[PDB]
Amino acid sequence: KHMVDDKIHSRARGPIQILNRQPMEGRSRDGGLRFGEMERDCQIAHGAAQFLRERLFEASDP
Amino acid sequence: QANQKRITTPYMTKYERARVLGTRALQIAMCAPVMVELEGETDPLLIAMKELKARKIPIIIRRYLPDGSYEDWGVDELIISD
Amino acid sequence: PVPPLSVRPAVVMQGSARNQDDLTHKLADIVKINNQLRRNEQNGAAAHVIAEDVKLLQFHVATMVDNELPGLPRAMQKSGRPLKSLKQRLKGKEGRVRGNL
Amino acid sequence: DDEEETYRLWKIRKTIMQLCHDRGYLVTQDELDQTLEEFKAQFGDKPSEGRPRRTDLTVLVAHNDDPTDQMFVFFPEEPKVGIKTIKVYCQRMQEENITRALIVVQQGMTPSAKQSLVDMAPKYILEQFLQQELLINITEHELVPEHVVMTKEEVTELLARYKLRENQLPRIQAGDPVARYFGIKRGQVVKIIRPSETAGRYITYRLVQ
RNA sequence: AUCGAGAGGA
């Protein structure tokens, strides 16, 4: 039952939550992906400070 | 700190190179004068790479030592590793 | 300290049911019991009655701050579900810090 | 019952001589490596009967820099050291003009003696050592690198060069076994030179807190 | 839309 047509999802400035102005959840609600603690961890190891700021502040909830 | 002596390495770091290229690319994309002869280039990333290879980047790196002092290095004064 | 409406937003239903936040419900409980305590202490009340009122106000404020107190029961909504305290909002994963910062 | 006791006493004496030598004190070569036969001929063979009595194993050792600065080595008779023994030792150092001493307890220290040791530190300083930690020389273990005390001039030079405060440095507790062996104080810094598999040799600096 | 639960994929 795993048809790719039900797994593809992309987000570009869609709806945001009400408690926090962060992107919604679930492709059904046009929500973005979660840049979690391990992702920030790997970006820290990279040293991409500007990319980390863009992901966690600029592209999430300015 | 006297400019006659400096303790930091004379080689540009990868992080310094990445940030200098990004900042100069943004400046170029915001209509800044170019320090190289653009043959046919029209994209800020390769324009900044050409400027870096020409050692004509108008950016000064302020290397902050842990003690609280800083040493200012020009991009043209640093060896480019890559 | 009363949080603003942003911290405790009034959600909008698919129709017109303006459900209040659990923090708003706890705040309303605190205001009503505080008014009752004020009127009781201004009028004549028994020492044990005043002590019980103080205990209830203690419970309400302490459950607003943290609703996982040992021994004491959790504060229940008028539906059958435990409330969410300000400590629970930022305690662990899915909490404020680890889940939005 | 007796051979074990005399072997223990000889080993403690050897360990204390090595500790004094590592602390920068006048330790002769023969007293540095004294064999069982020499120890027997010098002190005795039957510690149970009184030869050697623990009172006779006292050591007077002087610093390399100044004979006017020297420390006493004490082996108390009683198993548990009391405030009375501490007081008589303090009186002995008063009359002999001695500012440093070592107390080699058999079992442990009385709490009042420990408190007196803590409070009386400035004028007369003296340290307490269980007998068990003295049966082996800790600095000779393979896990224990070489520790060397830094003078004040060297500490100032290091700080000046690294442009950092004493705080920034890694720490070693005053109650650390090696710190107790070297008899250092809070505020002093040690130099740890250890072999490395990535650079060959590495030097790290530890400040006592 | 919120909470909770269940079933699942890597």
Side-chain angles (χ1 to χ4, degrees):
Chain A
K1 59 159 302 180
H2 302 296
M3 271 67 85
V4 61
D5 292 332
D6 319 300
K7 276 165 179 282
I8 180 180
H9 157 68
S10 56
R11 194 219 160 82
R13 272 202 269 120
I16 46 191
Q17 309 180 36
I18 193 96
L19 185 46
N20 38 19
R21 279 77 180 284
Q22 293 176 178
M24 269 299 211
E25 297 86 357
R27 54 183 309 272
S28 49
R29 304 174 273 279
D30 203 9
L33 272 308
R34 172 157 162 88
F35 196 98
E37 309 216 67
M38 327 195 66
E39 285 77 10
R40 175 200 66 103
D41 258 13
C42 155
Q43 280 331 99
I44 276 188
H46 273 277
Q50 291 137 261
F51 175 71
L52 208 43
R53 209 178 94 108
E54 196 246 341
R55 280 297 123 186
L56 298 171
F57 178 39
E58 275 79 314
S60 188
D61 49 353
Chain B
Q1 209 165 358
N3 196 84
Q4 265 59 239
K5 67 164 285 205
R6 266 173 296 189
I7 53 152
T8 51
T9 50
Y11 296 82
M12 198 183 248
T13 81
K14 48 172 108 80
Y15 316 102
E16 291 196 4
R17 154 158 59 79
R19 211 191 152 186
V20 156
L21 286 162
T23 314
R24 188 53 189 160
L26 194 66
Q27 277 166 41
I28 287 164
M30 281 167 79
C31 267
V34 202
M35 327 262 261
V36 292
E37 316 303 306
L38 286 181
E39 271 93 0
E41 298 278 355
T42 176
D43 211 41
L45 271 283
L46 319 90
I47 300 177
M49 280 289 330
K50 275 208 76 58
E51 269 182 351
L52 211 83
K53 283 313 278 169
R55 304 165 85 81
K56 303 275 272 187
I57 290 280
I59 298 208
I60 286 152
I61 288 130
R62 185 161 256 160
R63 287 169 171 196
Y64 280 114
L65 273 307
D67 50 42
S69 54
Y70 53 86
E71 314 191 305
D72 285 345
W73 288 79
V75 169
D76 51 280
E77 331 193 349
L78 283 164
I79 304 89
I80 287 283
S81 47
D82 195 73
Chain C
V2 165
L5 296 322
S6 65
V7 185
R8 33 178 205 90
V11 84
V12 48
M13 208 67 164
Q14 87 276 334
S16 57
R18 202 73 98 89
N19 201 339
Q20 301 305 288
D21 206 29
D22 83 278
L23 222 49
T24 304
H25 287 146
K26 190 48 91 150
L27 261 173
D29 175 326
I30 272 170
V31 192
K32 65 182 306 310
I33 185 134
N34 188 65
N35 289 336
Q36 170 235 5
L37 165 57
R38 164 78 159 273
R39 71 171 180 256
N40 283 12
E41 74 110 352
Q42 286 292 336
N43 309 348
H48 90 95
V49 156
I50 284 296
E52 181 66 35
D53 171 296
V54 170
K55 282 206 314 291
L56 215 38
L57 186 87
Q58 265 313 131
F59 172 80
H60 291 133
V61 157
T63 36
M64 211 205 68
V65 181
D66 169 352
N67 199 333
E68 243 184 334
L69 290 210
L72 287 163
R74 287 99 171 81
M76 226 65 45
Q77 202 64 63
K78 319 169 183 180
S79 274
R81 51 160 198 83
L83 258 64
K84 191 160 98 202
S85 52
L86 278 172
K87 162 145 154 165
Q88 276 199 337
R89 273 178 165 207
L90 61 93
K91 207 202 305 181
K93 80 183 90 146
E94 159 273 336
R96 184 58 75 250
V97 192
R98 277 181 72 179
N100 304 275
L101 291 173
Chain D
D1 54 336
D2 190 271
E3 60 266 21
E4 306 290 327
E5 196 66 32
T6 173
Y7 173 67
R8 278 164 154 75
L9 284 191
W10 167 76
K11 181 78 63 65
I12 306 314
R13 183 144 154 100
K14 185 186 273 325
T15 295
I16 307 304
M17 303 290 313
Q18 271 154 221
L19 171 165
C20 298
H21 193 67
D22 268 337
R23 273 178 193 209
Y25 290 60
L26 257 283
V27 152
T28 48
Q29 174 44 250
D30 317 326
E31 291 175 288
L32 191 50
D33 49 12
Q34 168 171 193
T35 207
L36 248 183
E37 273 65 52
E38 291 196 44
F39 181 90
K40 289 230 203 47
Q42 191 211 112
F43 277 120
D45 42 352
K46 318 200 156 298
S48 147
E49 82 101 18
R51 212 190 27 252
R53 196 186 329 132
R54 215 84 72 76
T55 326
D56 318 300
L57 312 144
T58 325
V59 190
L60 211 30
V61 61
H63 216 309
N64 299 339
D65 317 340
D66 204 350
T68 324
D69 184 275
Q70 63 284 60
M71 138 174 87
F72 252 124
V73 175
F74 286 134
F75 301 101
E77 231 53 35
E78 295 92 316
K80 173 174 320 283
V81 159
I83 209 189
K84 334 162 191 173
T85 68
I86 290 304
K87 284 306 296 172
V88 47
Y89 279 141
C90 294
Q91 280 315 285
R92 161 71 150 287
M93 281 166 298
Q94 290 204 306
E95 40 211 353
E96 215 78 14
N97 240 327
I98 284 315
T99 207
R100 299 208 62 114
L102 282 170
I103 285 327
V104 183
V105 317
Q106 219 67 1
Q107 197 267 332
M109 211 65 158
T110 38
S112 304
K114 225 196 205 62
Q115 190 41 46
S116 64
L117 262 54
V118 165
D119 58 47
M120 104 168 281
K123 251 279 300 192
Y124 314 86
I125 201 44
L126 44 86
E127 316 179 303
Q128 173 273 0
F129 266 127
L130 272 37
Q131 198 181 45
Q132 44 207 136
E133 327 152 86
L134 263 42
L135 266 307
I136 67 144
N137 207 260
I138 164 177
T139 80
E140 328 209 323
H141 197 249
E142 75 170 48
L143 296 174
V144 177
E146 164 156 359
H147 296 58
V148 50
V149 196
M150 256 191 299
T151 76
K152 215 149 38 170
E153 295 85 47
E154 310 162 14
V155 171
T156 36
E157 215 253 8
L158 158 68
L159 293 194
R161 193 192 82 121
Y162 270 118
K163 313 288 203 332
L164 48 85
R165 327 160 306 180
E166 293 191 300
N167 189 2
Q168 330 268 30
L169 294 174
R171 306 259 219 276
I172 165 176
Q173 315 218 265
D176 215 72
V178 191
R180 271 156 44 102
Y181 177 99
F182 276 110
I184 55 193
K185 63 180 180 179
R186 183 179 179 300
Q188 274 185 302
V189 201
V190 280
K191 191 168 89 152
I192 303 149
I193 327 164
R194 68 218 208 199
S196 208
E197 49 203 87
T198 42
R201 204 191 311 300
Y202 188 51
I203 279 176
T204 174
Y205 294 101
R206 272 194 193 285
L207 170 139
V208 178
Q209 261 302 110

